[PDB]
Amino acid sequence: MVNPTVFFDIAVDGEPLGRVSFELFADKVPKTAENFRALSTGEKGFGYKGSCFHRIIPGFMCQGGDFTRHNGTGGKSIYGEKFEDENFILKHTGPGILSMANAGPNTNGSQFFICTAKTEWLDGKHVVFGKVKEGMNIVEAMERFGSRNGKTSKKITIADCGQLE
Numbered sequence: 001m002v003n004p005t006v007f008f009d010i011a012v013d014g015e016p017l018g019r020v021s022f023e024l025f026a027d028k029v030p031k032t033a034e035n036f037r038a039l040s041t042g043e044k045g046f047g048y049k050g051s052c053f054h055r056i057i058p059g060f061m062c063q064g065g066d067f068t069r070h071n072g073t074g075g076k077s078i079y080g081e082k083f084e085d086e087n088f089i090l091k092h093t094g095p096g097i098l099s100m101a102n103a104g105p106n107t108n109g110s111q112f113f114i115c116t117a118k119t120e121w122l123d124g125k126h127v128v129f130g131k132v133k134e135g136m137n138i139v140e141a142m143e144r145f146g147s148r149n150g151k152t153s154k155k156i157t158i159a160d161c162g163q164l165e
Contacts, residue, residue, distance in 0.1 A: 028129075035110070050157065054066060054072055087127070088123065088124045098112060142156055
């Protein structure tokens, strides 16, 4: 059963930018991969469609997935509560790594980040569960709207998202 692929169609102040696709490592972190997959399809009745990337820091990361409060304070998983750190098998090895944001041990919800640099200090603290497969260039384009404190200079949104074959 092949690892799923999901896509985000990104816009900038409502104007299309491009598509980023991700391989989700369901073979290694199935519970975490499944959360992200089902939030991307919206099949549980909530998820990432229409949400923003609220914190973009060039040379570090692009963080999104707070579909309830749009600022880093919200989000929820498909599991009715925040869920555990599944494992730390995979490491933050460089740009394109897809990993869970959190606020302490075992507090995964919906927020995630895309690395734009190697972030090894996060190893063992944030669960890595995917990587960018296509459109790393689009992540780099997104990154340019960020700033040192993370505030974006244009609204960066997931205008559509879902699963590709």
